[PDB]
Amino acid sequence: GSHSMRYFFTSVSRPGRGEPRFIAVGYVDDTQFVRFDSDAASQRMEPRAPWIEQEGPEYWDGETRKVKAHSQTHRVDLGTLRGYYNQSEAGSHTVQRMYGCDVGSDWRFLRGYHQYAYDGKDYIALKEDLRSWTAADMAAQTTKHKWEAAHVAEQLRAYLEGTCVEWLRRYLENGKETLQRTDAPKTHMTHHAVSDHEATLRCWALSFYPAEITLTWQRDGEDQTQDTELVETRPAGDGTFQKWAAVVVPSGQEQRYTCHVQHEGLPKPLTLRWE
């Protein structure tokens, strides 16, 4: 199928308490492989996947150098943006940055992206055409025009269509045992009595990869989305994911309900019936 590489940068200012916190993580699809903590001891980009650990000294020195430059750029942005919005010098603020690229089933470039946020909302984004910008507000305009004259889009486009996809492909090759795998959900239902006339039916999906999954309940066919408690898909901590969906059912009607499961790793969708 298709694949993505995404880098996530978060910078949080800490007035009086020295320089901002800077954290970087990299993912291929749903698997983290990179990560950097300005508060960490190493001061180096560090491996977070087995298949990236033996990449070599040049790689780690190189990502370390570049990631440090990201740290300094964001540190200055924190001040610049503070000035844009005339905000107090005592308050903590957040800059977030996400960029990456996708490749199709054939591993050819599919799309690139570069999003930027200040204090939890959109600030400026690279448009799909990789040539223009979408500015969220007044302050974004100043940055939008600045990047236009600085031909920043061109720089990013060259990265997104070149280095980004080139190394995504390299990683998919290197970590092919991990990244090019599907782990179908191991599923099951549990039954708990709420009262003497009600019961909780919970539908579980465990140990699956990638994260994408659909868990739904039906009663006699009718989707019970509005009566279903559906938790967010969560990491198990070993690279796999978990999810459940539960309904509260009148005791005695258990046979009317079915849990339906869809995942990329399933030959066909699953239908679980308490019986």
Binding site: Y7, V34, E63, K66, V67, Y123, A150, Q155, T163, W167
Partner: peptide, 9 residues
Amino acid sequence: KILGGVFXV
């Protein structure tokens, strides 16, 4: 691999 160059908001 992360982006090489420069910038400045």
